[PDB]
Design a protein around this ligand. Structure first.
Ligand SMILES: Nc1ncnc2c1ncn2[C@@H]1O[C@H](COP(=O)(O)OP(=O)(O)O)[C@@H](O)[C@H]1O
Ligand SMILES: Nc1ncnc2c1ncn2[C@@H]1O[C@H](COP(=O)(O)OP(=O)(O)O)[C@@H](O)[C@H]1O
Ligand SMILES: Nc1ncnc2c1ncn2[C@@H]1O[C@H](COP(=O)(O)OP(=O)(O)O)[C@@H](O)[C@H]1O
Ligand SMILES: Nc1ncnc2c1ncn2[C@@H]1O[C@H](COP(=O)(O)OP(=O)(O)O)[C@@H](O)[C@H]1O
Ligand SMILES: [Mg+2]
Ligand SMILES: [Mg+2]
Ligand SMILES: [Mg+2]
Ligand SMILES: [Mg+2]
Ligand SMILES: [Mg+2]
Lengths: 76, 106, 533, 526, 527, 105, 49
């Protein structure tokens, strides 16, 4: 929950998923179809120095990248 | 008066006892009486009292004059109280009560 | 070499405004001095010749009286030991009702003599043990000092004679009249059941006509007026309601939902008809006086005026309960007509003016009732307040007499007899406690000494005469007030008697307070800071 | 009306003064806690601004309780916090090492050497330090409980809990072992969330134990419920068991006289329906993070069920892990699998003047609580800190089974290795290389100084010993102040802790060596 | 000056011997103040708050809390004493004295250049030996009423006046024996402590029942019911507003009256359920109902109940539900859905006492109450507070004695024997820790010293008499506070709780060891 | 106290407080002057208000050049001054022996 | 527990404006630092250049 909008957009673009602000098709019904789903080879929650973050590893339909910078303190 | 490390009553408490305080009470009653003395009888006069707001009042009535005076002396307030009592029970003689009481004390 | 530093340890760790007194001189002697000072302040108001004191509290209110408990209450006492003695006096007032000045004087004398004993060489423990032994001896002796018993509490004359002494210390000059008033009021109350309720005696203060014009009314008086037009009923049929005299409404939320013109046109008329029906149903039971604890609606008042019903609105629920007790009605919670059991009855309810205040009077012709009231007149508010204090003292004395009928001679006779017997007992007792026992006995002299000083005679001559007379064997002899020379007279025949229970409780409480003060060895006072209340 | 190119409150400092000030600030931060290292360390009293007292010898707590103005000191404090968070040990070591490297760097900065050369030499040195540390390590058989206990002991010999060594070691080892958990092919320990430490002042420290379950400061809602259930079936919840307002605005309109009573009866019926849905699973204990209605309590007692309300979410998660239950929010969707079977005893008992709820006989619990009984709150806080250090060390060893000799033996071995390597560079940066290599000797030197022995004689002897071939495990005895082989004394350290300490110290030196200007006083401009 | 002051100019620091001096001075000050509390012969202290409230006390923990002190070491010692009071309920003054004497004895050697670490090692060795000796010397015994009376006396005599202690001993022992279930932990919450402010101090007593600080709110309810059924309920009998914002809509006055009459049906149903139960249970006027309700009752329901001769109490305390179910023997009800005569409690007498503007209800003459009340009576508020604290200490002491069958001789005998055993064991300790062992023994010797000093006798002469008698006889001889001669504390009946002594040893040693190892005090959290 | 009643602005240390104050001052002087005794003592730098520099380990000079305002310190300083005036040596030992006598007492 | 008092003895007897530095870190290292600063101030004027 509370995923940042830019992060969600990047994840959807990389994984092939589609942002869905609502569940409402053009028939007036409320449905969610499997074609609207992104895919990835692994999703984990790793531990990075007493904290945790979610890694979406090896997304399909597009390659993305992120960098985790390890230093000595916040200023570094 | 040796200053006790912890005083008995609250600081600033004023106590007066003995003959001098009773004499002072009699003098205060005299002072209250003389403020209504001239308003007695067919040749009596009127008093004009202006409050803080500037709204003046004119009266020949002893009870009214005494009420309009901001009397704070504890012994003097008894004369105002008996003037009010005479006004309530009878309605006339509110000057005679104060004059008689102060004359007894004197 | 110009400053003495604070001693290392606790003295340095003490807070910025805190104080710490330890040892004999710093703590015990200071406490004794403070208690002695308080006793001196209250001493001059003791006995029939006691003098009123005009005390002005922090709220600019004026108190004039010689009641010791009231004076101590209105004084802003700060020293904690004197605070403890004041608590003892207030406890004596609450338990009995008279003897607060005795408690204060006895405690002061005991603490003074305790300081003397400590100075001559005794320890605190020995003094405390001696006082405890002497208090036990005094409590053993006291039942043997009873001279007579009340032996009747339904008699006006006997009760008045018994109560005269209690209300002679206050209002010395005119005590027979007040004694008769309080005796009549108390005899009206106190039914065949032995229980007597102090709150059943009410006091109404109406200013103007001098206290000699006061009277006792078998009923109640309320300083208010009638809501309606009817102002006098001679065969009252009071119906009391604790609810407002108005059509009852919902409790969550009520809104009048109108959907047609007819409902809008008929709503107010129907509501008025309903109120009229309720009021007429109330009136058809014969009720002609209605007392409500809440507001009175205009339609209800109009319909009550139509049916000739007297309306009285009591603001306080305490007054409502007292009226229900004194009339015999049950405070209904709705506007239902009262059943014959719940309907109250009274001989006469009417509106009258006393002085310049309009009052409503619920008067019983019978010499009976649950609640009786005393109408106090006077020329000053403070004078009526002091007379009310005297009335309270007399009522408490009557209550004590109901609890215990034993009486002991007054005017210092009991104190002198106690002192003589305790001195005799302490001589036979060996050890270091004999000094404390003798000092406890000598502390009883402060009562006849205070009486003699206030009466304007030499206390020493009075005390010597009292010891002589008690030495021949007259144990019912006290000092004579109406004499310019030190003289004594019999108190049993003079009727100057005070309750045994009051003496017992006062002695116990004063001894406990003095011992408790003596037990303290260190005082750690925090910073006073604020604390307005 | 001055021109004021910059703001009035802006101050600029530059040049050698800035570098000297930064290095002196780091040295001061090091000197604050220099004496709090080693088995013979002395504790310090910290006065909390809020009025509390922190009495400890842990480096991170001491540095965290100190407010400083110089930004270099702030950097050092952040370094201490980073070391504490990453591995949980070596805080004093990393602070002292950073101070020493910054001192030996100031030595060169005073001459005409540019800071970039010193930084490059430091980075090369750090690489060789890591290589040598990995080289001189030894493996560990995690199955052998005795070796794990010895490692935890070596971790806690320098803390106030060292008096009760075996007890603390067993507590930490058991807590870590039964908080270890694996699911979906992912392994975790999570000392932070589970393995709670609950401290109850009073009693004796020997009575401290880790429970095979959890303990909370809670009591039954109604006294009629049982306070001792043998083999309870626990059901956990989040939603309140009481009637609540809806999300939308739902005003009613009553025109018939019987609708008010009807509505109240429907409220009661809703509560009864919820309670019946809960009872359908036949549980014995019901735990809720929110309130439980009194009528709900009656309906539950009718079915002989113990109910506890207003439990913290963290406590409820710990209970779920301990007793194998799953928290549910809608009782109508409660399933059999969600019922917690596995707790072997539930008991509410009074400790001191307060009730505590025990679920303390779980079979295979994945969460636990540690009950600390001690003299006072400060003693128990220090004990909790020491036990946290022990658990962190145990987790580090479990993740990385490599060990490194302690007592300064590793420092001297790495210093000798780097000194031998420096003989071949023959460049200009060999001097900073050798200086930062020998800066590692501050750890044995500090151990000797705290022990009270002669520093110069012992360090000379230690260096001479390390010049031999097989002497990498020779360090300083912290008590007797004598040169002893650490395979005989038995003091060993996890390789992860040493690596993190070395890396963080070198990187702090690099970061502070890089600055030459300071501007201050400007507005936040948020 | 120091590093901290260099980084933070507005910081206060004490380093090296300064820290030891500061801590030892604070401990010595606290010990000097609390010396006079120890023993039944100790002096009574008087405490005045900022608002002017007067408190007479002798308890160590109470005195520490009301100290006007802001010292760090004082705060640490106060926390330790607070924990000691919380768990064992006794030994706070002994705690402070032993900590202070430990620090003083340790300083006596540290000032001679000795390192504190050696002293702490000696301390821990001596503590181990002392715990072993205490295990050896305890007196395991099944405790009948006499032993509990002796323990309660040994506590209350130290807390209050001798006669008040004599009364309170019977009170507390009888209460504990009343609420004590066989081989079950004692629940001290089941002994209600109620204060009344009218009689003397010695009038306090034990009621085999319950006392409630509130009475019936309806003047028509009975003031005294001889034979009573008790209904303990947690059901609100007053008007309740609907949770979902009902509101009433009507079009005429008659409709409004109908709605008003029909808005109380829900509560009237429960009231009529209670009435039906009362009429079924008792068809005569001999018995009666007392309805104790935790939640309020509106005047309509009060009137409806009073019309049927039922006395009802509202807004009872939460603990009173368990207390009444344990005393009267009923079942606490959270709803009246299924109420039967079997859920009703019983009480042989219920009456109301009026004291000023407060009502007190007495529920006594129960069959076999498992929860009783201790009515504290006195003429002053401070007297009531002092008696309440003394009663808490006595209850804790008796419960501690019941918990473990052992009990330790008092009057300082155990400390004297422990010191002698430690002196004998001292040669077995290797190194310079013998100095710490000697310091620990001398610190333990503080209790007989302070007892003899408070009794007025000479300190050193009395102590050497006691020690010589113990050495020559081997008995556990304490300090006779009346004559100063050695006295066998076991035979006289001066008993101390074994758990209290063990807690004293452990906590005092731990805190002294931790303080001695402190070498710096910092206050640098500002700015 | 009794004295403070007559003179409100009076400082008094009475009973054990006087002993504590005197012994604390003596112990402070002893703690300062311990390091002077013997040839292995430590040099002390004495900087005056005007900035004058004095290096010494003499007991009397050090006593006169510390900034002390204590009565017991003044008495001990007078004793040491007399010792120096008549014999010229033993001031440090004088202070040490006085302090140790008070401590042992 | 909000202030650290001065240690009993010489610390309390010191005058209000006086300063006392004792021990290696407090005295010797500070003196060396001051001398180093003075030499640094004069250093750049040494020699013909
Ligand atoms: N007519 C009298 N003659 C002599 N003594 C009297 C007389 N009337 C009252 N007393 C004494 O006055 C005392 C009462 O004093 P009082 O002012 O009432 O103090 P308190 O209210 O504390 O009792 C009693 O001890 C009584 O003996
Ligand atoms: N028995 C011992 N003998 C010698 N050195 C020891 C001993 N135990 C621990 N040490 C050393 O003391 C250091 C631990 O100091 P510590 O107070 O834990 O600092 P930190 O908390 O920063 O790790 C380790 O480097 C270790 O090598
Ligand atoms: N009658 C007595 N005779 C001799 N010694 C006693 C007597 N009563 C108590 N003591 C001793 O005095 C001590 C009382 O300590 P106390 O004042 O209660 O300190 P605390 O409140 O900290 O427990 C106990 O250790 C006990 O051994
Ligand atoms: N070479 C030495 N070896 C051993 N002791 C010495 C030597 N020289 C002096 N002392 C001792 O040291 C003390 C020096 O005291 P000193 O510093 O002179 O104090 P003061 O100046 O007050 O006399 C003397 O008591 C002397 O006995
Ligand atoms: Mg006229
Ligand atoms: Mg009287
Ligand atoms: Mg460590
Ligand atoms: Mg005790
Ligand atoms: Mg010399």
């Amino acid at each position: 929950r509370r995923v940042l909008k830019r992060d969600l957009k990047r994840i959807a673009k990389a994984s092939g998923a589609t942002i869905l602000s609502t569940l409402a098709n053009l028939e007036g019904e409320e449905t969610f179809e499997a074609a609207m789903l992104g895919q990835a080879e692994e999703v984990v929650q790793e531990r990075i120095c007493d904290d945790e973050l979610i890694l979406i590893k090896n997304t399909k339909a597009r390659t993305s990248a992120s960098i985790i910078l390890r230093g000595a303190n916040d200023f570094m | 008066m040796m200053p006790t490390p912890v005083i008995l009553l609250k600081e600033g408490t004023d106590s007066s006892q003995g003959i001098p305080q009773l004499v002072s009470n009699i003098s205060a009653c005299q002072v209250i009486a003389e403020a209504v003395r001239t308003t007695l009888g067919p040749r009596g006069m009127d008093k004009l009292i202006v409050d803080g707001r500037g709204k003046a009042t004119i009266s020949n009535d002893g009870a009214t004059i005494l009420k309009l005076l901001d009397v704070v002396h504890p012994a003097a307030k008894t004369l105002v109280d008996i003037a009010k009592s005479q006004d309530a029970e009878v309605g006339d003689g509110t000057t005679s009560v104060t004059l008689l009481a102060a004359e007894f004390l004197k | 070499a110009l400053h003495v530093p604070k001693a290392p340890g606790f003295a340095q760790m003490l807070k910025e405004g805190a104080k710490h007194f330890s040892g004999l001189e710093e703590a015990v002697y200071r406490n004794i001095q403070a208690c002695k000072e308080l006793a001196q302040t209250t001493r001059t108001a003791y006995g029939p010749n006691g003098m009123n004191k005009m005390v002005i509290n922090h709220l600019e209110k004026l108190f004039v009286t010689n009641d010791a408990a009231t004076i101590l209450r209105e004084l802003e006492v700060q020293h904690p030991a004197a605070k403890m003695i004041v608590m003892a006096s207030h406890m004596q007032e609450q338990e009995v009702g008279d003897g607060t000045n005795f408690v204060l004087v006895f405690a002061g004398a005991l603490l003074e003599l305790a300081e003397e004993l400590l100075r001559i060489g005794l320890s605190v423990s020995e003094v405390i043990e001696g006082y405890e032994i002497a208090c036990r001896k005094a409590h053993e002796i006291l039942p043997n000092l009873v001279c007579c018993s009340a032996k009747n509490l339904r008699d006006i004359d006997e009760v008045s004679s018994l109560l005269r002494t209690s209300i002679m210390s206050k209002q010395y000059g005119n005590e027979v009249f007040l004694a008769k008033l309080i005796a009549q009021a108390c005899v009206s109350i106190f039914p065949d059941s032995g229980h007597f309720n102090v709150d059943n005696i009410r006091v109404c203060k109406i200013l103007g006509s001098g206290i000699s014009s006061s009277s006792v009314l078998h009923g109640m008086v309320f300083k208010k007026e009638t809501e309606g037009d009817v102002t006098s009923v001679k065969d009252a049929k009071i119906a009391v309601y604790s609810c407002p005299f108005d059509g009852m409404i919902t409790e969550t939320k009520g809104t009048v939902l109108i959907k047609t013109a007819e409902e809008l046109m008929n709503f107010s008329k129907g509501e008025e008809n309903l109120m009229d029906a309720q009021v007429k149903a109330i009136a058809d039971t014969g009720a002609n006086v209605v007392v409500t604890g809440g507001k009175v609606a205009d339609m209800a008042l109009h319909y009550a005026n139509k049916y000739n019903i007297m309306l009285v609105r009591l603001n306080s629920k305490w007054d409502l309960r007292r009226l229900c007790k004194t009339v015999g009605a049950t405070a209904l919670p709705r506007l239902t007509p009262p059943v014959l059991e719940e309907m109250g009855h009274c001989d006469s309810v009417y509106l009258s003016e006393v002085g310049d205040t309009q009052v409503v009077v619920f008067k019983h012709e019978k010499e009976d009732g649950a609640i009786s009231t005393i109408v106090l007149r006077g020329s000053t508010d403070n004078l009526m307040d002091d007379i009310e204090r005297a009335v309270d003292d007399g009522v408490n004395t009557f209550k004590v007499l109901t609890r215990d009928k034993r009486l002991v001679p007054g005017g210092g006779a009991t104190e002198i007899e106690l002192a003589k017997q305790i001195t005799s007992y302490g001589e036979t007792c060996p050890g270091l406690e004999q000094y404390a026992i003798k000092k406890f006995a000598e502390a009883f002299e402060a009562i006849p000494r205070a009486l003699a000083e206030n009466s304007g005679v030499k206390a020493n001559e009075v005390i010597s005469k009292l010891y002589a007379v008690h030495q021949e064997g007259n144990k019912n002899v006290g000092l004579d007030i109406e004499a310019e020379v030190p003289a004594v007279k019999d108190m049993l025949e003079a009727g100057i008697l005070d309750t045994y229970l009051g003496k017992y409780w006062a002695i116990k409480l004063a001894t406990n307070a003095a011992v408790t003060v003596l037990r303290v060895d260190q005082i750690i006072m925090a910073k006073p800071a604020g604390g307005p209340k | 009306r001055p021109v004021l190119v910059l703001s009035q409150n802006t101050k600029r400092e530059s040049g050698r003064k800035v570098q000297s000030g930064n290095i002196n600030a780091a040295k001061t931060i090091a000197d604050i806690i220099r004496t709090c290292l080693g088995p013979k360390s002395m504790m310090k009293m910290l006065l909390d601004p809020m009025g509390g007292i922190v009495m400890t010898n842990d480096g991170n707590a001491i540095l965290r309780e100190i407010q400083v103005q110089h930004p270099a000191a702030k950097s050092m404090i952040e370094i201490s916090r980073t070391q504490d968070e990453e591995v949980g040990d070596g805080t004093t070591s990393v602070i002292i090492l950073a101070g020493e490297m910054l001192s030996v760097a100031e030595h060169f900065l005073e001459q005409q050497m540019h800071p970039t050369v010193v930084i490059s030499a430091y980075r090369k040195a750090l690489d060789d330090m890591i290589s040598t540390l990995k080289k001189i390590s030894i493996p560990v058989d995690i199955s052998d409980s005795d070796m794990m206990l010895n490692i935890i002991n070596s971790s806690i010999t320098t803390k106030a809990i060292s008096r009760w060594s075996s007890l603390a070691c067993n507590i930490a080892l058991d807590a870590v072992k039964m908080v270890q958990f694996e699911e979906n092919g992912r392994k975790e320990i999570d000392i932070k969330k589970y393995a709670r430490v609950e401290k109850i002042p009073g009693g004796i420290i020997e009575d401290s134990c880790v429970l095979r379950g959890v303990m909370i400061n809670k009591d039954v809602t109604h006294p009629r419920m049982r306070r001792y259930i043998k083999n309870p079936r626990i059901v956990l919840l989040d939603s309140s068991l009481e009637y609540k307002k809806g999300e939308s605005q739902t005003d009613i309109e009553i025109t018939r006289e019987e609708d008010f009573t009807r509505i109240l009866q429907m409220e009661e019926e809703y509560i009864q329906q919820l309670c019946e849905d809960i009872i359908q699973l036949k549980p014995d204990v019901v735990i809720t993070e929110k309130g439980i209605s009194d009528l709900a309590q009656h309906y539950l007692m009718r079915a002989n069920i113990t109910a506890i309300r207003r439990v913290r979410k963290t406590d409820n998660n710990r209970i779920a892990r301990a007793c194998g239950a799953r928290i549910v929010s809608r009782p109508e969707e409660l399933r059999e699998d969600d019922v917690g079977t596995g707790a072997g005893l539930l008991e509410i008992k009074k400790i001191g003047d307060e009730y505590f709820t025990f679920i303390t006989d779980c079979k295979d619990p994945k969460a636990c609580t540690i009950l600390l009984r001690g003299a006072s709150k400060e003693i128990l806080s220090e004990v909790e800190r020491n036990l946290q250090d022990a658990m962190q060390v145990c987790r580090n060893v479990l993740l990385d089974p490599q060990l490194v000799p302690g007592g300064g033996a590793s420092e001297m071995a790495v210093a000798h290795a780097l000194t031998e390597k420096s003989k071949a560079m023959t460049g200009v940066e060999q001097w900073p290389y050798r200086a930062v290599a020998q800066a590692l000797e501050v750890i044995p030197r500090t151990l000797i100084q705290n022990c009270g022995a002669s520093t110069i004689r012992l360090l000379t002897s230690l260096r001479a010993k390390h010049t031999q071939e097989n002497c990498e495990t020779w360090g300083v005895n912290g008590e007797t102040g004598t040169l002893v082989d650490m395979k005989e004394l038995g003091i060993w350290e996890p390789l992860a802790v040493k690596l993190q300490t070395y890396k963080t110290a070198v990187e702090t030196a690099v970061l502070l060596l890089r600055i030459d200007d300071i501007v201050s006083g400007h507005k936040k401009k948020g | 000056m120091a590093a901290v002051k260099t980084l933070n100019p507005k910081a206060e620091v004490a380093r090296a011997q300064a820290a030891l001096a500061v801590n030892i001075s604070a401990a010595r000050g606290l010990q000097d103040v609390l010396r006079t509390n120890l023993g039944p012969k100790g002096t009574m202290k008087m405490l005045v708050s900022g608002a002017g409230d007067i408190k007479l006390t002798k308890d160590g923990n109470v005195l520490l809390h009301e100290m006007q002190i802001q010292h760090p070491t004082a705060s640490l010692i106060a926390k330790v004493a607070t924990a000691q009071d919380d768990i064992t309920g006794d030994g706070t003054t002994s705690n402070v004295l032993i900590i202070g004497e430990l620090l003083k004895q340790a300083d006596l050697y540290i000032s001679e250049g000795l390192h504190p670490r050696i002293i702490t090692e000696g301390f821990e060795a001596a503590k181990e030996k002392a715990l072993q000796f205490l295990e050896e010397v305890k007196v395991s015994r099944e405790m009948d009423r006499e032993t509990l009376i002796d323990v309660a006396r040994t506590s209350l005599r130290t807390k209050v006046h001798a006669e008040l202690a004599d009364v309170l001993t019977e009170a507390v022992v009888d209460s504990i024996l009343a609420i004590k279930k066989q081989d079950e932990p004692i629940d001290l919450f089941m002994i209600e402590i109620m204060e009344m402010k009218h009689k003397s101090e010695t009038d306090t007593s034990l009621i085999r029942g319950l006392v409630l600080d509130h009475g019936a709110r309806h003047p028509d309810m009975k003031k005294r019911v001889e034979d009573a059924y008790i209904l303990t309920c947690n059901v609100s009998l007053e008007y309740e507003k609907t949770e979902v914002n009902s509101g009433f809509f009507y079009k005429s006055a008659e409709e409004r009256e109908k709605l008003v009459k029909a808005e109380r049906k829900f509560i009237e149903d429960r009231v009529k359920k209670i009435i039906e139960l009362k009429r079924k249970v008792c068809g005569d006027s001999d018995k009666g109902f007392v309805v104790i309700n935790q939640k309020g009752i509106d005047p309509f329901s009060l009137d409806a109940l009073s019309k049927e001769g039922i006395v009802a109490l509202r807004r009872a305390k939460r603990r009173n539900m368990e207390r009444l179910t344990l005393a009267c023997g009923g079942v606490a009800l959270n709803s009246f859905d299924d109420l039967s005569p079997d859920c009703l409690g019983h009480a042989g007498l219920v009456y109301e006492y009026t004291l000023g503007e407060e009502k007190f209800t007495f529920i006594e003459k129960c069959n076999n109450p498992r929860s009783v009340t201790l009515l504290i009576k006195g003429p002053n508020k401070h007297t009531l507070t002092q008696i309440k604290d003394a009663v808490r200490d006595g209850l804790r002491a008796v419960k501690n004695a019941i918990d473990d069958g052992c009990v330790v001789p008092g009057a300082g005998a155990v400390e004297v024997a422990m010191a002698e055993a430690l002196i004998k064991h001292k040669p077995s300790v290797k190194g310079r820790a013998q100095l710490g062992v000697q310091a620990f023994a001398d610190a333990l010797l503080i209790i007989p010293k302070v007892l003899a000093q408070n009794s007025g006798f000479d300190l050193q002469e009395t102590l050497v008499k006691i020690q010589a008698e113990h050495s020559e006889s081997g008995q556990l001889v304490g300090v006779d506070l009346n004559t100063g001669e050695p006295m066998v504390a076991a035979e006289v009946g001066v008993w101390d709780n074994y758990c209290v002594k063990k807690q004293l040893l452990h906590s005092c040693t731990v805190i002294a060891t931790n303080i001695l190892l402190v070498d710096e005090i910092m206050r640098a959290g500002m700015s």
